[PDB]
Every structure is written in C-alpha cells, then in structure tokens.
Amino acid sequence: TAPGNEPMAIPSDYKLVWADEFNTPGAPDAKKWRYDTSRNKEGWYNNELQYYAAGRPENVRVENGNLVIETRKERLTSMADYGGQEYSSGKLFTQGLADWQYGYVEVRAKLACGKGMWPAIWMMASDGSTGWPALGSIDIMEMVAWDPTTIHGTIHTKAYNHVIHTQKGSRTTAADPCGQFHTYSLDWTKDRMLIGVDGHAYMRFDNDHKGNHDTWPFDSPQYLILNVAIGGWGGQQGVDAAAFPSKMEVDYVRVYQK
Numbered sequence: 675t676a677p678g679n680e681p682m683a684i685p686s687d688y689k690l691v692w693a694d695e696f697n698t699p700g701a702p703d704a705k706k707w708r709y710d711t712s713r714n715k716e717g718w719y720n721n722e723l724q725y726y727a728a729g730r731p732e733n734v735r736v737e738n739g740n741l742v743i744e745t746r747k748e749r750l751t752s753m754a755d756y757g758g759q760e761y762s763s764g765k766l767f768t769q770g771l772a773d774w775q776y777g778y779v780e781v782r783a784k785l786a787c788g789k790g791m792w793p794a795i796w797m798m799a800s801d802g803s804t805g806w807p808a809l810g811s812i813d814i815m816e817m818v819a820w821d822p823t824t825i826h827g828t829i830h831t832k833a834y835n836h837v838i839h840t841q842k843g844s845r846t847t848a849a850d851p852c853g854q855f856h857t858y859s860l861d862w863t864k865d866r867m868l869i870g871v872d873g874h875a876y877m878r879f880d881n882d883h884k885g886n887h888d889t890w891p892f893d894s895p896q897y898l899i900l901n902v903a904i905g906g907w908g909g910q911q912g913v914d915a916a917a918f919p920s921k922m923e924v925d926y927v928r929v930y931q932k
C-alpha cells in the first residue's frame with residue numbers, strides 16, 4: 675500500500691544529532707532509554723504474550739558494543755506488575771529523553787528469530803493527545819519470525835492504520851536478518867518518509883500537503899522504541915519453545931538532522 679523503490683542515504687547536509695552506539699557495557703544509558711512497563715500487569719496490546727522486564731539484564735543489556743533485547747520463556751512471578759505471562763522480553767524508548775521532528779534514523783541490528791518473535795524498531799509521537807492511532811506512528815522495522823526474512827516498513831495515522839486495514843506499508847526481504855546485521859533506516863522530511871534496508875527504500879509515504887492531521891500527523895516530534903514482542907503478529911504459526919532465548923542485537927541508533 676505504500677510502495678517505495680529508490681535509494682536512501684544520510685543526506686549530505688545533515689549532522690549526527692543523537693546516537694546510542696551502545697559503547698558502555700551493562701544497563702542501557704538511562705539518559706537515552708527508559709523502560710516501558712505501562713501494560714505489564716494488564717497484558718500488552720495486539721494479544722501479546724510477553725512481560726517487558728525493566729532493569730533486568732537477562733532481558734535488556736549492553737554487551738560488546740550492542741544493545742541486547744532478549745526474550746526468555748519464564749514466569750517473572752516475583753514482579754509487582756507481573757501479568758501472568760509465559761515469557762519475558764525488553765521494551766526501551768527515548769520517550770521523555772529525546773525526540774526528533776524530521777531526520778534520518780539509521781539502526782544497525784541483528785533481529786530475534788523463532789516462531790513467536792516480533793522484533794520492532796519504531797516511533798510514536800511525543801504528543802499523544804490525539805491518542806493511537808491519530809498521533810502518528812512509524813514502524814522503521816518490524817519482522818515476525820514465522821517469516822523471518824521479511825522486513826516490514828509501515829506508518830499509522832488516523833486515516834491509515836491496521837485497526838481499519840488502511841495502514842501505509844511495504845515490505846522487502848533481507849539475508850539471514852537474525853544472523854547478520856543490516857541497517858534499517860527512515861528518511862523523514864516535511865514532504866515524505868522513505869523506509870528502507872541497507873540503503874534501499876522499499877516503502878514511501880508522501881505528505882499530501884492537505885494540512886489534514888488524519889493523513890499527515892508527522893510535523894511534530896517522534897521518539898524511538900526498541901522491543902521484541904512475543905505472539906500477536908509474531909505468533910501466527912505458534913510460539914516455539916525451542917526458540918528461547920532469542921535476542922535482537924542493536925549495534926547503534928543514529929539520528930541525523932539538518
């Protein structure tokens with residue numbers, strides 16, 4: 675629904691304005707990432723099966739220059755916010771720490787595989803007053819590991835979203851995404867978004883320039899989100915116990931702006 679076919683690359687006139695190179699082993703940098711626990715006890719959206727553990731190295735850690743988000747089959751019943759889940763995982767976002775209006779986002783990542791796994795690199799608007807989906811969401815990368823070579827790039831707005839099946843997205847494939855790094859990229863300007871892998875946009879979404887927040891909510895800042903969900907879209911061919919633990923490794927997040 676949002677086909678692209680054009681190169682993409684860090685614009686020559688942009689500077690690197692924000693980066694997490696995951697240089698510092700241990701916990702993620704608290705000045706860059708917060709943990710999202712907001713629906714642990716209730717159950718996450720999308721019929722998701724994971725508990726997202728905050729402050730827990732087994733799920734979220736920096737090692738050897740990479741962020742590691744790791745899913746595990748386990749019941750974290752000692753957690754006050756435990757929601758009865760069979761799995762643990764990690765969700766980090768830059769909410770309240772850093773956000774961007776326009777820019778080139780480049781994330782170099784090795785994905786988490788195993789039927790059930792749903793790694794994602796995405797964004798939501800800092801101003802959520804209009805609620806989901808109207809606020810505007812940018813999926814720079816989703817993969818569901820029943821189809822682990824397929825890379826999905828999607829935007830959601832009030833007009834264009836998955837609840838009403840009008841989401842603007844595309845897909846491509848990439849070599850062994852769980853075994854080798856690729857670059858997952860967004861080029862967002864006032865005119866359009868390109869979403870790509872390894873310097874190729876497979877997804878394009880234009881600003882129609884109608885000043886309709888329903889079709890272009892993207893003239894306000896967005897923060898970045900990294901997670902690995904379990905089940906929902908990831909669970910289309912079940913959740914494979916033998917797949918755990920599974921990890922997404924992120925070498926870096928770099929954000930460029932004019």
Ligand SMILES: OC[C@H]1O[C@@H](O[C@H]2[C@H](O)[C@@H](O)[C@H](O[C@@H]3[C@@H](O)[C@@H](O)O[C@H](CO)[C@H]3O)O[C@@H]2CO)[C@H](O)[C@@H](O)[C@@H]1O
Nearest residue numbers: 719720792793794796805806811812813816830836903
């Ligand atoms: O169902 C209404 C509730 O929606 C909440 O928002 C969720 C939404 O339900 C869920 O579908 C969505 O899922 C994300 C995808 O749209 C896509 O953007 O990729 C993400 C990464 O895979 C995936 O999580 O997430 C929305 C935000 O959590 C509202 O938060 C809630 O107020 C509302 O009642």
Ligand SMILES: [Ca+2]
Nearest residue numbers: 695696739925
């Ligand atoms: Ca690194």
